[PDB]
Symmetry: D2
Subunit: 115 residues, 4 copies
């Protein structure tokens, strides 16, 4: 499992359940080609997006549908979505965890990168 996403709710103090996540890779013509997708579990985590064989060097984008989450809770949000863009595997393969912390008018995202 070379890529995993984990999401938390700063208002309720809970994992974010059933939020949509889309992944893209950048093409030779500089457009974004769809690659993988899913929804977060009851623990706020999304596993099984790609394999070591498929996840080659390149530029990748992760898009989290934050607006649909806050609408479902009846709270008014600021952003359309939350986005992370990064270069992968420049020094060999690694395992990547993308962590996001969510509030209606503010978010943070951190990468935890291992061996």
């Amino acid at each position: 499992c070379p890529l995993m996403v984990k999401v938390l709710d700063a208002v309720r103090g809970s994992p974010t359940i059933n939020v949509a996540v889309h992944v893209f890779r950048k093409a030779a013509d500089d457009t974004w080609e769809p690659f993988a997708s899913g929804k977060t579990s009851e623990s706020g985590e999304l596993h099984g997006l790609t394999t070591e064989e498929e996840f080659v060097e390149g530029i990748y984008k992760v898009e989290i549908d934050t607006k649909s989450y806050w609408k479902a809770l009846g709270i008014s949000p600021f952003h359309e979505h939350a986005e992370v863009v990064f270069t992968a595997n420049d020094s060999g393969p690694r395992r990547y965890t993308i962590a996001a912390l969510l509030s209606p008018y503010s978010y943070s995202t951190t990468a935890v990168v291992t061996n």
Copy 2:
């Protein structure tokens, strides 16, 4: 002054000087069209991007060039940039401050919105 951007360095505890910022608006055909650009000053702030007349209701994108900032200091960071996307002025005119706080493997962003 209806749109302002402010950037800080969380390693040194200081404002971030000469950082590039580009702004786009969503067109009727779903394309991103160039709206404004500039660089941060000594206080880490960028003023005078637009006017109340020009800044109509729509979806806007603010892209901050965080990779060039880190590379100039000898560091290879995680992110390519920091990007913020939002609907503006849908309940009438407002003033917007977009703030960003930077680390090599993390960033946070916050919006302060006031009624002029």
Copy 3:
């Protein structure tokens, strides 16, 4: 003005008005002795806590009353307060801004330090 405090609400995207702030210094016998206090203004800022003369080298503590802010809006938050502890002026006089960003189950804090 060598010490300033600024507070924001991350649910509403707005400055936080009338929030209580207390400051203490560590005494030679290891006790905390009261140094200054005040409340935030309409812009969420608190100015004029001390002077360059009075603000000597030492360990300082800033306590922000976040529980009362949330309770006044009908909310029962996680934290009792937000507290920041730091050594000041150990390489000569500097200006300090202490910023805090508030959610019911989370807070972040940042220091901006400049050479006057």
Copy 4:
């Protein structure tokens, strides 16, 4: 396991290894009585601090020795430590995870509270 602590490094993109953590409970005379302590693992996590029987209602403090961590890495820090103070179990027992994200001049702390 009613209480666990997890810590991350925003400069290196890694868990924080071997950082000291102390826990206190507030006494009738308003002083802080020492309760439990330990160090974070290779995954940045600290388990086994207390039990359901011992962890009764009250006000608790968690202190993380952030200054010693940054000194060991040769980077100059702002804060003496990072502190979280909270009331526990007011509506019955819960499981509490205290998560902290660390930079030299800035930190955040979030609570994840379950059933």
